[PDB]
């Protein structure tokens, strides 16, 4: 009964703290924003980082990111091989293409912000989250007797 067309195991999403949206013949995985926070907001003017992996299965594709929270700047080759992938961000844990954001509008962890990823053949909106990686818990000041 549990091994029919609808299965509880085959539809399970990976627990990765990121989105796995698709595009034109391109699959984007683990799309997240690095923005180490200190207060309720990350103020405009600060630069933040965009991280993901782009995969296709058979020979090249170009790409460009646009968004509404400031401007996105790319640095690198920014093309995909036949049976390979394009890694942009190096999330904490890995032992060169970089996506930087100027962030005209303030951001906060917990909400989703729309990003547009455009290729030479396909383009999608993603609505990415913010993820903190191997950063330890930040200290909270002690209370009093009350």
């Amino acid at each position: 009964c549990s091994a029919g067309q609808i299965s509880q195991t085959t539809t399970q999403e990976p627990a990765v703290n990121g989105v796995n949206a698709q595009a034109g013949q391109v699959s984007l995985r683990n799309v997240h924003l690095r923005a180490p926070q200190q207060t309720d907001y990350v103020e405009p003017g600060t630069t933040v980082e965009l991280l993901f992996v782009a995969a296709n299965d058979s020979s090249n594709k170009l790409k460009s990111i646009t968004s509404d929270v400031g401007e996105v700047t790319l640095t690198g080759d920014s093309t995909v091989p036949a049976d390979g992938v394009l890694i942009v961000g190096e999330p904490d844990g890995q032992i060169a293409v970089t996506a930087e954001v100027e962030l005209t509008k303030p951001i906060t962890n917990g909400l989703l912000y729309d990003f547009t990823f455009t290729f030479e053949d396909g383009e999608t909106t993603v609505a990415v989250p913010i993820s903190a990686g191997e950063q330890p818990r930040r200290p909270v000041p002690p209370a009093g007797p009350g």
Partner: protein
């Protein structure tokens, strides 16, 4: 057999899956061979053989009774693999190895089949 013949007449998978089809032919194969034929052999034996030889009874009647019940309960235990969320045996009646090892086919249906 009717189920697996219905889901074999058109190229696409219409209403079955791989796992269900595997269990289905495995259990068809086992039930038809071991729970129908091998038994029906002995039904015809203690129906006319005492009459044919001119005897009033079989050699051990109270042991003759035990065989039928062993048959019925063994068959029920083997078939009751369909109640599990996993399913019954899905490795054919032949049961080749290594496919029935703890690594491959780790389910509880296969265990009930064996026992």
């Amino acid at each position: 057999a009717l189920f697996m013949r219905t889901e074999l007449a058109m190229p696409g998978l219409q209403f079955l899956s791989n796992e269900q089809f595997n269990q289905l032919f495995t259990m068809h194969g086992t039930v038809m061979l071991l729970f129908y034929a091998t038994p029906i052999v002995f039904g015809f034996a203690n129906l006319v053989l005492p009459l044919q030889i001119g005897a009033p009874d079989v050699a051990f009647p109270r042991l003759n009774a035990l065989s039928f019940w062993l048959f019925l309960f063994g068959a029920l235990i083997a078939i009751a693999g369909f109640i599990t969320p996993g399913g019954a045996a899905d490795f054919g009646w032949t049961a080749y190895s290594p496919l029935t090892d703890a690594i491959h086919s780790p389910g509880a249906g296969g265990d009930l089949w064996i026992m």
